[PDB]
Amino acid sequence: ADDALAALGAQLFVDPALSRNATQSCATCHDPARAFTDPREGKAGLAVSVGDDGQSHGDRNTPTLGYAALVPAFHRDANGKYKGGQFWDGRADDLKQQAGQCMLNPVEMAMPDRAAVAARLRDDPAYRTGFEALFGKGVLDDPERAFDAAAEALAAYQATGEFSPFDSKYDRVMRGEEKFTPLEEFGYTVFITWNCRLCHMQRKQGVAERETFTNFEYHNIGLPVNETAREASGLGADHVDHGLLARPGIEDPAQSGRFKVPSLRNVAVTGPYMHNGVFTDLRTAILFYNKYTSRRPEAKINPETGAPWGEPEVARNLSLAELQSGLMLDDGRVDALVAFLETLTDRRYEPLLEE
């Protein structure tokens, strides 16, 4: 049943029949050749993805599905910090909820309702055999049961070893199979001693069994609007992406502007960066953190535009305690971090490092 369920997820994953006009599958925006991200050029470059209708742009960068199965279900922990979930704003509890939401989102896959999904599943002979073996006869005639089963299969497929293979250079080095280059070694060391480790390690202390370089928390790091993506998404110039506060049932204004800390695995190959695809380069995303620590004028400047980073989209709730470390990354340590984070690339994506 575990193999089988996952095998169904695989079929569903690449089936454009789960989109309204049958033009796109999960694999369209979550392309396996590119660490499950979108390689397609839209009105805003690679920043945001184009929907089933061929025009509608999202306001958020499409993230990797690699390692998403490692994220705990959404919850508030004993100290009042939200952890886990799926999407940049945590609006899905887990992989299963999230599958259903993506299928129904009108700016993306855009199925009208659970029943429309059910009809599409019902249309295909291999789905009848496949769903009924796992869920019981006539599952596909119950719009609720069918849809739910579909999401479950998609979820089970993203939990396969294939989405989280733990075969990066970093993984091999921790097994003792290879050594780091001195640059990479220095990079790793900088990463564990500087602020990065306060948000991009699973645990506060201890060793993680399956490290994915995120504590699964919610932070506002004070990013600007990505202007071309915001224009393209057509949400409007007055629109504010509130991050986690957008999740239904979150009312706390202290969450506004906060986004799920992304796993840094495969980061070297999944540009552009942040929740709005605002920076094209990995180096820029690192340099960004210098805005909070450095005294040099160059630190105010986005090296991509040659102009100030820009006002944060949300000016409150900034993670200042973490971000204002009092210590600036010189060019040396930036290069080092780049060498380290590159080591986090899955074996199968190492060829991609070159371009």
């Binding site: 921790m174 060793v207 210590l327």
Partner: protein, 125 residues
């Protein structure tokens, strides 16, 4: 207590300078002034900065990265003073350097040295 002999880790008393996690500690163990192995005493402020060392754990034969963080904004505790230097590098490699007061990032810009905690932050390599 031949101070020049190779340092010998134990995993049985945290308040002693030969406790394994303290292999590059400089200053004072926080457990001795009302903190604990991995927390600051009341009234002090926890820095965000560290120096690391790889310290051998004689219990499991494994080596762990220890990020020493300072508890600041109080005068030096005076209790359980210790100084070890396994893998300690000169100041020009500040990552591994332990004469530096690592109080950066402490609330209220506290920069005075009280004591040092010894949390594990990773497995070494």
């Amino acid at each position: 207590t031949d101070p020049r002999a190779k340092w010998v880790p134990q995993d049985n008393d945290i308040q002693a300078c030969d406790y394994w996690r303290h292999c590059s500690i400089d200053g004072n163990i926080c457990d001795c002034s009302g903190g604990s192995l991995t927390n600051c005493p009341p009234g002090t402020k926890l820095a965000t900065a560290s120096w690391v060392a790889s310290c051998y754990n004689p219990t499991d034969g494994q080596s762990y990265l220890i990020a020493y963080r300072d508890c600041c904004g109080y005068n030096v505790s005076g209790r359980c003073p210790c100084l070890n230097t396994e893998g300690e590098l000169p100041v020009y490699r500040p990552e591994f350097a332990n004469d530096i007061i690592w109080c950066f990032g402490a609330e209220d810009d506290a920069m005075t040295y009280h004591c040092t905690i010894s949390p594990i932050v990773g497995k070494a390599s």
